[PDB]
Write a protein that binds this ligand. Structure first.
Ligand SMILES: Cc1ccc(-n2nc(C(C)(C)C)cc2NC(=O)Nc2ccc(-c3cccnc3)cc2)cc1
Length: 252
């Protein structure tokens, strides 16, 4: 896990994080383009602990659609080395590339995320924050699930009401994330108060069917939004049905 500083060449700043700047760079073991998370106040054991907790958590996972931890440099200045997702945040990608993106690409992103989530569920790991803002774009045909973070408008009723986060609450959030992708990065319940969401969910109200979303895909989203968590499908079901929906779109 520990990387020698020499094997890392530091490039341009690609944005800011909670503890410091995020830079892009290259790592040689062949030759990989990487993301480098820095930490300004990591001389403080307290700040170093919180900063390096990200590496501790990410180490256990290995999936093609989950952001990969390359390693860590624990000597000061402490850095976290991540796999680089060059096309950045999914929300901006979808907004910018809206008229360059076909339905088949949007379903591909939803499918790839369901495979990432089926893997997390296979490990008995609950993400707790599934939203398009936590997805990065590696390439035009490739998205990765991460965690860069209350998101009431994405949350299952039991998470709102009782702070209950389970595999079933993850499925609810995934349905909202799927709606965001097909809405090209448009946020759910726009111009609606976080207190007005709770009331609408209880009454039976759900996010409307996105324009040009196949009705089969929308039927899948509504299954994720079953009020009763025990009636929600699991990610193995979602992965299989998204695969079928993807082939129906690829075979026009
Ligand atoms: C406390 C804590 C916080 C986050 C995580 N955490 N957990 C995950 C899952 C495996 C559950 C999806 C991913 C991350 N971190 C992350 O996604 N980090 C990350 C940050 C930046 C980039 C990045 C930024 C810009 C360009 N390329 C990559 C990639 C991954 C674990 C613990």
């Amino acid at each position: 896990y520990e990387i020698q500083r020499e094997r890392i060449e530091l490039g341009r700043c690609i944005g800011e994080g909670q503890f410091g700047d995020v830079h892009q760079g290259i790592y040689m073991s062949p030759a990989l383009a990487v993301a480098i998370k820095t930490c300004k106040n990591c001389t403080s054991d307290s700040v170093r602990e919180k900063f390096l907790q990200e590496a501790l958590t990410m180490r256990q996972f290995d999936h093609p659609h989950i952001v990969k931890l390359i390693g860590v440099i624990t000597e000061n200045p402490v850095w976290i080395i991540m796999e680089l997702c060059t096309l950045g945040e999914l929300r901006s990608f979808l907004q910018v590339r809206k008229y360059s993106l076909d339905l088949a690409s949007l379903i591909l992103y939803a499918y790839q995320l369901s495979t990432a989530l089926a893997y997390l569920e296979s490990k008995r790991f609950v993400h707790r924050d599934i939203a398009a803002r936590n997805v990065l774009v590696s390439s035009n045909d490739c998205v990765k699930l991460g965690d860069f973070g209350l998101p009431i408008k994405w949350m299952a009723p039991e998470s709102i009401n009782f702070r209950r986060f389970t595999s079933a609450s993850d499925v609810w959030m995934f349905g909202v994330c799927m709606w965001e992708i097909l809405m090209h990065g448009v946020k759910p319940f726009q111009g609606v108060k976080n207190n007005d969401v709770i009331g609408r969910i209880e009454n039976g109200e759900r996010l409307p069917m996105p324009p040009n979303c196949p009705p089969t895909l929308y039927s899948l989203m509504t299954k994720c939004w079953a009020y009763d968590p025990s009636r929600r499908p699991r990610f193995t079901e979602l992965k299989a049905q998204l695969s079928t929906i993807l082939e129906e779109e690829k075979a026009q």
